[PDB]
Amino acid sequence: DDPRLLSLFSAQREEDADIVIIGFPYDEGCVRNGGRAGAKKGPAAFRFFLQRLGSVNNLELNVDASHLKLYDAGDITASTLEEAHEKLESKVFTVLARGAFPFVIGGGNDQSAPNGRAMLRAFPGDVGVINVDSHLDVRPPTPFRQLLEESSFSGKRFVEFACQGSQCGALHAQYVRDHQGHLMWLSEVRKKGAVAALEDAFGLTGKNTFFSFDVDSLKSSDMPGVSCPAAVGLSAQEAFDMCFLAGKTPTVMMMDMSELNPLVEEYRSPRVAVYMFYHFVLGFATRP
Amino acid sequence: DDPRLLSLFSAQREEDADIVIIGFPYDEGCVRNGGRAGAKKGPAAFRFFLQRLGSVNNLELNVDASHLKLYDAGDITASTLEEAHEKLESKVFTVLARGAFPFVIGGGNDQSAPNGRAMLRAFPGDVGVINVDSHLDVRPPTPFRQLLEESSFSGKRFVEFACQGSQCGALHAQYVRDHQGHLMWLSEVRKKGAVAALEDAFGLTGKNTFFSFDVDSLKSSDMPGVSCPAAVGLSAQEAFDMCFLAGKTPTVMMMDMSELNPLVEEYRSPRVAVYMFYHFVLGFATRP
Amino acid sequence: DDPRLLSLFSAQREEDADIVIIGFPYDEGCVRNGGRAGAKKGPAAFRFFLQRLGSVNNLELNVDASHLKLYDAGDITASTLEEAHEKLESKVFTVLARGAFPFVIGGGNDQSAPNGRAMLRAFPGDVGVINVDSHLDVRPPTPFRQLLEESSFSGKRFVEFACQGSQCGALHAQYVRDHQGHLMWLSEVRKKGAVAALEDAFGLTGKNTFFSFDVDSLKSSDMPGVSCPAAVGLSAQEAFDMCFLAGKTPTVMMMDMSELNPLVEEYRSPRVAVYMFYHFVLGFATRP
Predict the structure, then answer these.
(1) Tell me, what DSSP letter sits at residue B130?
(2) Residue B218, phi-psi category: left (phi > 0), alpha (psi -120 to 50), beta (remainder)
(3) For the CA atoms of chain C, what is the radius of gyration?
(4) Cβ of B187 under 8 Å from any chain A Cβ?
(5) Disulfide pairs (chains A, B, C) (predicted)?
(6) SS3 for C109?
């Protein structure tokens, strides 16, 4: 008599679900910039706590999510990464096309490229993207260099959120600016308040926004188990509040979560990741 | 020439002490709601740092606790839990009855039931209780379902402090409300300021208040070694400041501390627990 | 195409450098007051991340440090501690004497005594000192009892910054006060704002200030890998901001960093230590 997230998995068939969870068990992402291997373990660790956490009726926030149906579509499986990328993109697009909400649990942040392409096909010429990450993820041979190079995507509608000047090269910042993208450095986010800054960001991304949450953006005191841990960064509460906002914002059409790395830390961090998704689900329960 | 808490153990016999420490080395508590075993190791870890920490004259707070006498009454020992519960209750009551202050170090939070019964017998019909915990601890077959069911105890004088909506079931919240108890969710505590919110709580609990501090209520960045770690929760400084307030508040007649779990983390967390007690002792030195 | 701190090591010969790094791989310091052995491992761990971290052009702070030259003078090596102390002092003084900036990475905080003596010889009768530490480091047979006993040093120009009343004995506080030194307890630093409080401190220390940063002063949620971990203390961001201020303050003539202990924690903490130095270097790039 204390129903949790697991209780919401009552959609017999995928098409019944409001929210579809897709796993992407591949390392590729920040490991390429000196990050630790292990993000491929992210989906299993997330699922472990997914089955254990999250009051469906939350009397602190006074949100009852009990009427939502969730569905777990399992992991994308492939013999090569290219093939994994293609299946992920196709799967995400299919969810978007029938009007359900895909939540992709990674896995490294390179999942965000196929995810963005699924967005661009689902909402032709009318997509916005926010990359919540300590890095810009646009460096040459990354997920967002690919998308900014897309002909159909307007960089005015791309936001880099909670990026850190100590971790981001000047050429990469210039690349974003020159494509009309927006840089909301961590210190700005802090000065404005994380929720308030994110509201600003959703104002810029507009319709059909892809909410891309790289957990590398959280401070390692709260979130140690990630591929590229940060000394400073978003707090667990900021992350939770940001996910709640995203959930209640009708223009957010999908979400992914990258760089959860249980080989770095396996207990506290996957709980934070599930609680982030939980807050999203609560926000989503309030959508008109 | 730097006297610490250990120096205050100068009461040759228990009855000489202002504050009596009682250990309760039993797991039973949050381990029952998916928490890790190990809280029974709490008292020994606490004692380890008790002998090492805490300037008796603190020039930052300008409180000199050097005139207090502390006494360590050892651990409650028993062949069964029921028997352990009976001895704890009897021991706590005896301390209360002669007007000394019992501080009980656990151990899981089920110690709080026998502790509450010792209160109800010591101050017939005139007890208040605050449960500082992320959980409500009232779920059916918990420490406080027992006490709220007590005929002599008025629920108007029961406060759930820093509880977390994500961890607390709706039926349990309803149970507390229906018994006239008060829910001060973590986000409220934060909005008011922890010390300010606790002042409000002591206003509600009134005379003969039992200050029950479950360390599960602290955020795991500061307090990882507990049976049911929290992503968000009270900071170490908030906890310290709250314990100081409790110490200086003349209506607080006893204190317990539950869910310290050295098997989860054995270094930082027992230090925090001792520093919490330390701050209590400093506050207590200021009592009229 | 993302140059970092390692790129600034372009001084072929030491005398070319603006900033000279000196390692001091010796435990002696807080280990003597119940701290863990291992600080001697500090310099190697620092160097590991020194070669990996820190965008030289930081667009968040809008500071380009690319015109600075750094030089790593290696470790002080000796068969005894006294001899190590003598070589460190002599080496630091030589750097100061030719007008370069010595940054000493420890190692335990006893390095600060030889460092202070190098200051007193470089700027006869005109030195200021700030000890950022949770402890006062003046207890009888420490680095600063030695310096306060110096005939040529005015205690009015000595500040104890972010010291903690729970860790500091009353006699030691009295020792500092009686020598006209200043105590800026952690709670004061917090109330003022760390940067603002440090500005006040630099006002008191005045010309030729020795910025001594004991990492024991940081809270262990952010900085666990130190010899004497703290429950409460400076955040990583406060530490970073303080180092930036020190870097841009023309009166700060040298810096040391003590008690980094990779045997306590080897991943997150050395990164914080390098990021502290990084922020110093950024501030220093702005000096007139």
Answers:
(1) E
(2) beta
(3) 17
(4) yes
(5) 30-228
(6) helix
